[PDB]
Design a protein around this ligand. Structure first.
Ligand SMILES: [Ca+2]
Ligand SMILES: [Cl-]
Length: 496
């Protein structure tokens, strides 16, 4: 469960948040495969509540009506088509599996659902699965409200409703089997693995019992005996009875400390400095690298209400965001996920974005296609961070240096730092308020290297900055503190 099952030499996945299946299929072929992306985390493919107040929020997809693969992203035919086309170009699909719960207990009964399935939250009736009152934790939860009130009680965090979401009884073999049925449907279609949504709210043993029922991966694309990649979403910043490590038997865990701390460092908040990053990784008390799924932001905390708070860097913060993402992609710790977002009318009041609910770009609820601009960015308010040159080229950096050790660290004691990956890559950051001009040991073979942050290597040329590595491995780096992108990256495949 710990291996991503990506093609050899592909080291990242991208979250194409709220994208339609037909757009993801195209994206695999026209971009992700040639640019060396390992795979795609897709939004939940299963039927969800259609929530009209507010109007079609992104979070409606985290309230299941059934396991039909029928959503605003597409139907089962389109989903199957996407997984096939993506796998055929060597780009994997990971499903966001929402298995802890069905919808909100207060949602009105009816057919307001993305496939038109009937459901009745009040009577605990989801006939399209089918689930009934026997399949939920109503009796088991011991809190007064029936909802999670106290994170110091590990039992209620598992057995009670998260913000009132009907909590499935995952101890029951019937419920475990219905979930496995859904997941095996997806595996046989060809998905490579799963994000297990709200894993903190499930018992590690119930998750295991579900995973125990799963098929090996589709043998047309994956070697026999291949198991689905599992990454469990657990937000653990410490100090609670439930720890990320409790889930290690099932797969990897989301390390939410990673982006919280990195955001604080790059913002230079709370006295933190980039020079402190020298021991980044387990030295900062994160989970073991081989159990970590890392990221700068995710779909929830890029809206500022997550863990931790306002320190999270997002596309809105583009200059510092590119630096943080670049540091993450260069550093060997963890398996990396790149966010890809849509724009929404962010409106702050009282420290809160009142529009943080807004769903994907849409015409009266129909999600807009991803359009590609001549410069290869996206239109229709899709941000497409994964197509930003500075991010995409660092995705490739990480492929190029795969396996190479963290080495040749430099820091100035404040915010100017640099490091290499073996003899395959080197990266330099200036986050201080003065210029960085210094000669550093890059660990690289002598030659002329294209800086892949400012430009690209094309046809024996660089379109950006050129770095000159002498025969002793040393190169001069000049970075103004006022630079558009105050970091430089070079690697074996950017050499002329
Ligand atoms: Ca639960
Ligand atoms: Cl996540």
């Amino acid at each position: 469960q710990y291996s991503p099952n990506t093609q050899q030499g592909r080291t990242s996945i991208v979250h194409l948040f709220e994208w339609r299946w037909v757009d993801i299929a195209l994206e695999c072929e026209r971009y992700l495969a040639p640019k060396g992306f390992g795979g795609v985390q897709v939004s939940p493919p299963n039927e969800n509540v259609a929530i009209y107040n507010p109007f079609r929020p992104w979070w409606e997809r985290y309230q299941p009506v059934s396991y039909k693969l029928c959503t605003r992203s597409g139907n089962e035919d389109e989903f199957r088509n996407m997984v096939t086309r993506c796998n055929n170009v060597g780009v994997r699909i990971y499903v966001d599996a929402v298995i802890n719960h069905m919808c909100g207990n207060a949602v009105s009964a009816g057919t307001s659902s993305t496939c038109g399935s009937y459901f009745n939250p009040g009577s605990r009736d989801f006939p399209a699965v089918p689930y009934s009152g026997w399949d939920f934790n109503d009796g088991k939860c011991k809190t007064g409200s029936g909802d999670i009130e106290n994170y110091n009680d590990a039992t209620q965090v598992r057995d009670c409703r998260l913000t009132g979401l009907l909590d499935l009884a995952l101890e029951k073999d019937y419920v475990r089997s219905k979930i496995a049925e859904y997941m095996n449907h997806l595996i046989d279609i060809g998905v490579a693995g799963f994000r297990l949504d709200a894993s903190k709210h499930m018992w590690p043993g119930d998750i295991k019992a579900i995973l125990d029922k799963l098929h090996n991966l589709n043998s047309n694309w994956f070697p026999a005996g291949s198991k689905p990649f599992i990454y469990q979403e657990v937000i653990d910043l410490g100090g609670e009875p439930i720890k990320s490590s409790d889930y290690f038997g099932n797969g990897r865990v989301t390390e939410f400390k990673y982006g919280a701390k990195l955001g604080t460092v790059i913002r230079k908040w709370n006295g933190e400095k980039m020079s402190y990053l020298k021991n980044w990784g387990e030295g900062w008390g994160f989970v073991p690298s081989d159990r970590a799924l890392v990221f700068v932001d995710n779909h929830d905390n890029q809206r500022g209400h997550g863990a931790g708070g306002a320190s999270i860097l997002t596309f809105w913060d583009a200059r510092l965001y590119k630096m943080a993402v670049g540091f993450m992609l260069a550093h060997p710790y963890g398996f990396t996920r790149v966010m890809s977002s849509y724009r929404w009318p962010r409106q702050f009041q009282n420290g809160n974005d009142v529009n943080d609910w807004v769903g994907p770009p849409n015409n009266n609820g129909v999600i807009k296609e991803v359009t590609i601009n001549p410069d290869t960015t996206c239109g229709n308010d899709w941000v497409c961070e994964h197509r930003w040159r500075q991010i995409r080229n660092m995705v490739i950096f990480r492929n190029v240096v795969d396996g190479q050790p963290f080495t040749n660290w430099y820091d100035n004691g404040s915010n100017q730092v640099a490091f290499g990956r073996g003899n395959r890559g080197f990266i330099v950051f200036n986050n201080d308020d003065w210029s960085f001009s210094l000669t550093l040991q890059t660990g690289l073979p002598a030659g002329t290297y294209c800086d892949v942050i400012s430009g690209d290597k094309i046809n024996g040329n660089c379109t950006g900055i050129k770095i000159y590595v002498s025969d002793d491995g040393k190169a001069h780096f000049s970075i103004s503190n006022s630079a558009e992108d105050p970091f430089i990256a070079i690697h074996a495949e950017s050499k002329l």
